[PDB]
Design a binder for these strands. Structure first.
Lengths: 50, 94, 97, 88, 110
DNA sequence: CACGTACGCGCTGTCCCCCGCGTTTTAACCGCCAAGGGGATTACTCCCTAGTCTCCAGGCACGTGTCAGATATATACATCC
């Protein structure tokens, strides 16, 4: 479910939702396919996701 | 000779913010010079913004970027808000 | 009853920073402006407001220069301003550069 | 624990001590106190954020995501720090 | 059916003249075309800046027991507000004076 | 111009912190994918909107008469010596 919601947030870009509870909130959505591969691998690759 | 100034508009703005406070002639000339200086700075910055982007027209976007460049910090973001709402009302009307 | 050296200077500092009158007399400034102007060309007429605007420009420039000079003198562990403080301030501003 | 973040935040310490010493050697400084480097880092951060904020404003007037060199030239030009060698 | 000649400043809810700003932009040699919303936006920005300085100058006149704004009140309002101080830091105000400020080294002993 | 005293400057001590040097690490730099998006041009099409023109009307500026609040006297009641 976490992988699915991260894929939905990246593919339909949701910077406000991708920030969410992060204090810094420094999310880079350049190289969309790289972030999609990271979401397909593990959600813990993203910052403030564990 | 009808000498152009911003006298009555600054006076009614003063009556809006302070209904019981007057103003002197030297302060009025200083306010007129301030309004002319700020208008000249923003118009020159917007003309430069139109020139760098190969645009022959000046719209609200050039004036908005000129306010964001010249006015520093939080003064810019409230000024940008105040102008942006006015354009919305004027569109609703004309 | 004599006063300590320094409290009178502090009284003039607190007095002249409150009032906004011109601290230079009108006629010597007009004579100085006319003498400075007459070498560029002869036969120059001057409006009164032009000499007044030159006067307040000189006031603001010199007061800002003495603030920078006082900061230079305080930085050099002194309370007395010196011409070396003046030439140091103008350079950091770029006038002597 | 191999956990660490992807985004690095200590890049202001990436302007190292010998870099600031080389800058002062170009400036003609013989002796450097130990408290100089943090002040220099703060001054560099303030100057960089001013120039970069103006360059980002110049970029988003053009509806772009890429900060070109000409935007940096214009941002330096508005503050009175005009730079040659990139305008053309 | 020319309905009562409704002005642009009253349409925009502003007090500063929109049409006069439009005329000064057209004759000011900035661009040969000027959009419709640009004088509205510029008049609103000028009105906001004038209102901010006039409010602070009225407060400065109120703290000095005055009902009439003099250039000293404008100077105090500009210099005591740091955003206006770095907006008009390269600006001289005539008959304005300076802020009352004494360096702490020059203060006496106690 | 006279007096007087505070402070700028010179000298000395002292300690501390920065510089010079040697050694070890480490990341900058250069050269590599791997695909994909951003953006600068060239050409084309379309349409909305701002310039231009004519006409008119009311906003702004100037001038003037009045008007309500603030200031300065005119006369009457209460009071001290």
């Amino acid at each position: 479910d976490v992988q699915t919601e991260y894929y939905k947030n990246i593919l339909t870009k949701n910077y406000s939702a991708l920030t969410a509870g992060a204090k810094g909130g420094h999310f880079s959505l350049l190289n969309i396919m790289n972030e999609l591969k990271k979401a397909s691998n593990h959600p813990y690759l993203f910052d403030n996701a564990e | 000779t009808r000498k152009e100034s911003y006298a009555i508009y600054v006076y009614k703005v003063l009556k809006q913010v302070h209904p019981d406070t007057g103003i002197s002639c030297k302060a009025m000339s200083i306010m007129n010079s301030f309004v002319n200086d700020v208008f000249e700075r923003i118009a020159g910055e917007a003309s430069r913004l139109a020139h760098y982007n190969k645009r022959s027209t000046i719209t609200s976007r050039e004036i908005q970027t000129a306010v964001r460049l010249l006015l520093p910090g939080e003064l810019a973001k409230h000024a940008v808000s105040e102008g942006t709402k006015a354009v919305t009302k004027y569109t609703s009307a004309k | 009853h004599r006063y300590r050296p320094g409290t009178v200077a502090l009284r003039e500092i607190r007095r002249y920073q409150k009032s906004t009158e011109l601290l230079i007399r009108k006629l010597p400034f007009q004579r100085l402006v006319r003498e400075i102007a007459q070498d560029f060309k002869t036969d120059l007429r001057f409006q009164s407001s032009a000499v007044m605007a030159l006067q307040e420009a000189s006031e603001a420039y010199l007061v800002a220069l003495f603030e920078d000079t006082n900061l230079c003198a305080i930085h050099a562990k002194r309370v007395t301003i010196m011409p070396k403080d003046i030439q140091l301030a103008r350079r950091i501003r770029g006038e002597r550069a | 624990a191999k956990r660490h973040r992807k985004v690095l935040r200590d890049n202001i310490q990436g302007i190292t001590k010998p870099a600031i010493r080389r800058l002062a050697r170009r400036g003609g400084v013989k002796r450097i106190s130990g408290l100089i480097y943090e002040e220099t880092r703060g001054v560099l951060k303030v100057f960089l954020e001013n120039v970069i904020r103006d360059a980002v404003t110049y970029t988003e007037h053009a509806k772009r995501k890429t900060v070109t060199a000409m935007d940096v030239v214009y941002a330096l030009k508005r503050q009175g720090r005009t730079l040659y060698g990139f305008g053309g | 059916t020319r309905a009562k000649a409704k002005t642009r400043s009253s349409r925009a809810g502003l007090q500063f003249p929109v049409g006069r700003v439009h005329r000064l932009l057209r004759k000011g040699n900035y661009a040969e075309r000027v959009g419709a919303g640009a004088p509205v936006y510029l008049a609103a920005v000028l009105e906001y800046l004038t209102a901010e300085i006039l409010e602070l100058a009225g407060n400065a006149a109120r703290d000095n027991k005055k009902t009439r704004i003099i250039p000293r009140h404008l100077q105090l309002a500009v210099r005591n507000d740091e955003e206006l101080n770095k907006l008009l830091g390269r600006v001289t105000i005539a008959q304005g004076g300076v802020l009352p400020n004494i360096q702490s080294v020059l203060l006496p002993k106690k």
